[PDB]
Amino acid sequence: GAMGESLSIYKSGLKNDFQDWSWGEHSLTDTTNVESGETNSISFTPKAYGAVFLGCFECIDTDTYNNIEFDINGGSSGAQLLRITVVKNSKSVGSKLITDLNGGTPIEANSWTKIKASFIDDFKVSGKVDGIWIQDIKGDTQSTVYISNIIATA
């Protein structure tokens, strides 16, 4: 009813027709660091500017969902340097630093952090969005991160 809409993208596996277009090293079925109540996470070892990229052509209309959200675990080290990018019209149209999205704090090691980004507020993007990616920006290898509960929200 009046409860705002949500669209799951990954909840212990891909949902709602989203597609794995990732080019970095990752697994969609990591079972070593899972949130309570889930069975799998995406594991991602950020390196060589790889990224986890979840795609669904024009599936997210900002007239229905204001934000993109995910839970991230910083693994052994935390504090990974990552860029979160939104894709519209088959091109990247906006990016944000994960530390920025986390209020200026580097993501904590060994524990799960909610990451919220607003399409208009954070990416200055509106209309139909084709996907989101989480990209390594260090090149040099970073400790493995875990991603869970990817969801589009009003």
Author numbering: 552 to 705
Give the text the authors published on this PDB structure.
At the end of refinement, the derivative dataset (resolution of 1.8 Å) displayed 13 iodine atoms with occupancies varying from 0.42 to 0.83.
Here, we present the first crystallographic structure of a CBM8 family member (CBM8), DdCBM8, from the slime mold Dictyostelium discoideum, which was identified attached to an endo-β-1,4-glucanase (glycoside hydrolase family 9). DdCBM8 is located at the C-terminal region of CelA and is connected to the catalytic GH9 domain through a threonine–glutamate–threonine–proline repeat linker.
